[PDB]
C-alpha cells in the first residue's frame, strides 16, 4: 500500500507510537498507582490487540529506512520469530484482560513489555 | 495518557496516518483499477473501523497544537458532530463491506471521504 519506501516508515513508525501508547498507558495500573477497571482494560487491549498486528506489513521488501536495522531483512526468519514471540504474549496479554485478573495481567504485561525490548535490542538501531 | 500536549499531537497524527493508509489503500480497488476481494476488503475495514475511533480522544482538554485549529474546542459540539458524522459514515462503509457488495462499497467509500474532506475544511490549518 505504499508509493515509495519512506511511506512504509511512516506507516510503521506511525503504528509503533500509537502501540507505545496503548501498552504504555497502562502502567500505572499494573503498578497499582492507578485504579483497575477491568472493562476499562478489556477494551484497551482490544485496540492494543489490532494495533499490534499492524506494523510488520510495513517491513515489506525495499523498505528499507527510519531506524529499522537492515538485519530485520536478511535474517527475516529471525525477525518473525520475534514477531511472532511479541504478538504471542499479546495474546496471552488479552487473556489476562478479559478474565479480568490483575495479576495476572501485570505478569502478562511484564512478558509483553519483554518482547519490545527483545525486538529493539536485535533490530532497532541504536 | 499523554504527559504533554505534544504527546496528544504526536498520538492523533500518527491515528490519522493510519487512517489514511488504510482508507486510501482503497482506492483502486473502489475504482477498479486492482481486483475486488470481499473478505480482504471486510477485513481492511474491520482495522479501518478500529483506528477511525481513536483520533478524537487525543483533542482532549489542553492538546492544542500541530495543525489542529483551535476553534475545535471552542465550538466543541460542531467538532462533536463532524467526528459522529464521520464515524457514522465509517459503519456504513462496514455495513457495504461485510455485505461483499463492490457498488455499495464504492458509494459508501465516498460519502467517507467527504466527511474527511469536511471536517478538514472546517478544523485543519491549511
Ligand atoms: C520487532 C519484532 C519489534 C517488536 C516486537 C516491537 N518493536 Fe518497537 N520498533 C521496531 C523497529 C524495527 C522499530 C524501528 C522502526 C523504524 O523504521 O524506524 C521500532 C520502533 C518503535 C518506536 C518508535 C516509532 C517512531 O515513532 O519512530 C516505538 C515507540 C516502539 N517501537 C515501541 C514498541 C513497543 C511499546 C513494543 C511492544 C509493546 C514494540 N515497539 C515492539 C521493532 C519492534
Ligand atoms: C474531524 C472530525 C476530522 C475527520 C472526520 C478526519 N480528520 Fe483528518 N485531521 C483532522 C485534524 C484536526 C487534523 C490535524 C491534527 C493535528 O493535530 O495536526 C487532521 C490531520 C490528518 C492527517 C495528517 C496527520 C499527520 O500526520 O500530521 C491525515 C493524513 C488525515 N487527517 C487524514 C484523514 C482521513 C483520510 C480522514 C477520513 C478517512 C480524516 N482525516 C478524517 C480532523 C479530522
Ligand atoms: O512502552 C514501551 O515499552 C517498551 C519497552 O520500554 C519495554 O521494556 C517500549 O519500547 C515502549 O515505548
Ligand atoms: O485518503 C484520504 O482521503 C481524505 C480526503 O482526501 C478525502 O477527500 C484524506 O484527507 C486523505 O488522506
Same mark, same amino acid.
Given at each position: 500500500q505504499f508509493a515509495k519506501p519512506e511511506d512504509a516508515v511512516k506507516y510503521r513508525q506511525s503504528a509503533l507510537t500509537l502501540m507505545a501508547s496503548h501498552f504504555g498507558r497502562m502502567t500505572p495500573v499494573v503498578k497499582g498507582q492507578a485504579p483497575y477497571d477491568a472493562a476499562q482494560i478489556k477494551a484497551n487491549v482490544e485496540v492494543l490487540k489490532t494495533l499490534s498486528?499492524? &506494523?510488520?506489513?510495513?517491513? $515489506? &521488501?525495499?523498505?528499507?529506512? $527510519?531506524?529499522?536495522?537492515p538485519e530485520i531483512w536478511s535474517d527475516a526468519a529471525s525477525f518473525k520469530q520475534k514477531q511472532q514471540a511479541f504478538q504471542d504474549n499479546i495474546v496471552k496479554l488479552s487473556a489476562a484482560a478479559d478474565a479480568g485478573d490483575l495479576d495476572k495481567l501485570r505478569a502478562a504485561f511484564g512478558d509483553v513489555g519483554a518482547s519490545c525490548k527483545a525486538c529493539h535490542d536485535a533490530y532497532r538501531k541504536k
Open positions: 498486528a499492524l &506494523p510488520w506489513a510495513a517491513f $515489506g &521488501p525495499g523498505t528499507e529506512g $527510519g531506524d529499522a536495522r
